[PDB]
Design an enzyme around this catalytic site. Sequence first.
Site, PDB file in Angstrom:
ATOM      1  CE1 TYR A   1       3.384   0.959  -7.773  1.00 28.48           C
ATOM      2  CE2 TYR A   1       2.216  -1.088  -8.158  1.00 28.48           C
ATOM      3  CZ  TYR A   1       2.388   0.065  -7.412  1.00 28.48           C
ATOM      4  OH  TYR A   1       1.592   0.312  -6.318  1.00 28.48           O
TER       5      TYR A   1
ATOM      6  CD  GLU B   1      -3.241  -6.404   0.310  1.00 29.42           C
ATOM      7  OE1 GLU B   1      -2.703  -7.479   0.031  1.00 29.42           O
ATOM      8  OE2 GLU B   1      -3.457  -5.512  -0.524  1.00 29.42           O
TER       9      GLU B   1
ATOM     10  CE1 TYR C   1       1.144  -4.787  -9.019  1.00 29.91           C
ATOM     11  CE2 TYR C   1      -0.444  -4.747  -7.223  1.00 29.91           C
ATOM     12  CZ  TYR C   1       0.762  -5.192  -7.752  1.00 29.91           C
ATOM     13  OH  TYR C   1       1.533  -6.051  -7.029  1.00 29.91           O
TER      14      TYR C   1
ATOM     15  NE  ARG D   1      -3.304  -9.997  -2.919  1.00 30.66           N
ATOM     16  CZ  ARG D   1      -3.980 -10.479  -1.872  1.00 30.66           C
ATOM     17  NH1 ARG D   1      -4.420 -11.731  -1.860  1.00 30.66           N
ATOM     18  NH2 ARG D   1      -4.181  -9.715  -0.813  1.00 30.66           N
TER      19      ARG D   1
END
Lengths: 167, 166
Positions: free
Chosen positions: B19, B70, B25, B47
């Site tokens: 990002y 989620e 990610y 995570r």
Amino acid sequence: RPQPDQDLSGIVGKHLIYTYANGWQYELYVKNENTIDYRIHSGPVGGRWVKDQPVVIVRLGNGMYKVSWTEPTGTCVSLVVDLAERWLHGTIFFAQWVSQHPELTVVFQNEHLDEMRALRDEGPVYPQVVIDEFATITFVENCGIDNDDVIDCAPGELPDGYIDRTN
Amino acid sequence: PQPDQDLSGIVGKHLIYTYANGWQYELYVKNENTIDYRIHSGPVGGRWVKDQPVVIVRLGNGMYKVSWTEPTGTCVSLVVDLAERWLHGTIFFAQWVSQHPELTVVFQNEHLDEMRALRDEGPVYPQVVIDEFATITFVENCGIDNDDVIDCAPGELPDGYIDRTN
């Protein structure tokens, strides 16, 4: 491999009517770079309408835009709008209580913001209910920037053929 | 004239993206309606998630939309452009996730009940929304239903893994 140019002049001022694959008729006006008015004509929340919804807009490609926002009800929305090909894809993440009692969001929301936040804080919120549907854009016009007359009444108070106009 | 909904150009794809705020990610499209993902940096670095149910549509040539919710209450809608190697992410997270991102830093599959307890506890509102473009730095095809692509914590990977490009 560049990210696309972020000129929003091809989307601001646009006023569109669209029908989701499930038949629900929605209306959108892009008032400016970061604000929309909208009006819902059919489906579970037919009668619901909103002015001055803060929004984030990005350009994805030629005549293709993303529009995302959160609502005082707790609902989250992300649209992909293709003006060139006359279709739109909507993801609506609504709270459980909106799924259960859509009728309670059928208002001019601007006159009922505290009630919406009370219903939101009461919940239940979870699990969220998700709608992903394609829509056909049946009508598009240019109404320019910050025009407060485009969406200025309940859908029930419009002429009967307003929603059925095409170009 | 809505676009053809063949998802064969996206299923099997494994991608690493950064990002504009520098967060790294990682995503694997396991099948038409399932992803694994792994977060390397930013507030929720560490995570990772397997078998996240997802809704995918095709927007154009090499352009796809991927949306899901989620167990934390977080909502995600991504636009992925494989051809032009960029991605746009909208992440709607609850106030409690903004306050305590550390509490979501787990193998979520082994901690689903804890996540739902934290979600039901709140606070929820107002939601915090991230809209950011990412650069896709790496793409490969790993085929369908491959459980080996994302099978450990990002901390347990070889040192150069997230830095590979193509």
